[PDB]
Amino acid sequence: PKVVIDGKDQNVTGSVVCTTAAGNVNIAIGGAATGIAAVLTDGNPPEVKSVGLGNVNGVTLGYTSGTGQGNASATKDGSHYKITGTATGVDMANPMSPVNKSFEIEVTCST
């Protein structure tokens, strides 16, 4: 599993678990210390509906489709998923302007 936020590798150790419901793919990495999750469509190519990166460098980052904030794309190659885009968050100290960091997620939902 590979998670990169703002060009910085998170070196994630948490396991990757994927499930399906109501025509969507739910991807989740790790647990409390990680809090990463994603929601894709079960089509090809998959459309990113949301990505949650948890709290990184003081900001709770995530992407949400149809908000005008950030962007996100995904590709599926077998069980492998690649999600790239720009996540947004609130600057707790200076809420004047939002925070935009790029992210890249590469996971396999196998074994």
From Swiss-Prot:
Keywords: Cell membrane, Cell wall, Disulfide bond, Glycoprotein, Host cytoplasm, Lipoprotein, Membrane, Palmitate, Secreted, Signal, Transport, Virulence. Disruption phenotype: No visible phenotype in culture. Grows less well than wild-type in human monocyte-derived macrophages (MDM) over 7 days; increased human monocyte MHC class II expression, decreased interleukin 1-beta secretion from monocytes and MDM. No growth in C57BL/6 mice over 40 days, even in mice lacking gamma interferon. Belongs to the mycobacterial 19 kDa antigen family. Forms a U-shaped beta-half-barrel with a large hydrophobic cavity. This is Lipoprotein LpqH. Induction: Expressed in cell culture; expressed at a steady level for 4 days following infection of human mononuclear phagocytes. It is a lipid-anchor. Its main location: membrane. Disulfide bonds join C18-C109. GO terms for cellular component: bacterial extracellular vesicle; cell surface; host cell cytoplasm; peptidoglycan-based cell wall; plasma membrane. GO terms for biological process: biological process involved in interaction with host; defense response to bacterium; symbiont-mediated perturbation of host immune response. The keyword Protein biosynthesis does not apply. The keyword Lipoprotein applies. A disrupted strain immunizes mice against subsequent infection with wild-type H37Rv as well as the M.bovis vaccine strain BCG. It is found in: Cell membrane; Secreted, Cell wall; Cell surface; Secreted. GO terms for molecular function: host cell surface receptor binding. Based on its structure might be involved in ligand transport. A host TLR2 agonist. Plays a complicated role in bacterial interactions with the host immune system; some effects favor the host (induces interleukin 1-beta and IL-12 p40 (IL12B), both increase the host's immune response) while others favor the bacteria (increases growth in monocyte-derived macrophages and decreases host MHC class II (MHC-II) expression and antigen processing). Induces host (human and mouse) IL-12 p40 (IL12B, a pro-inflammatory cytokine) release by monocyte cell lines via TLR2 and CD14.
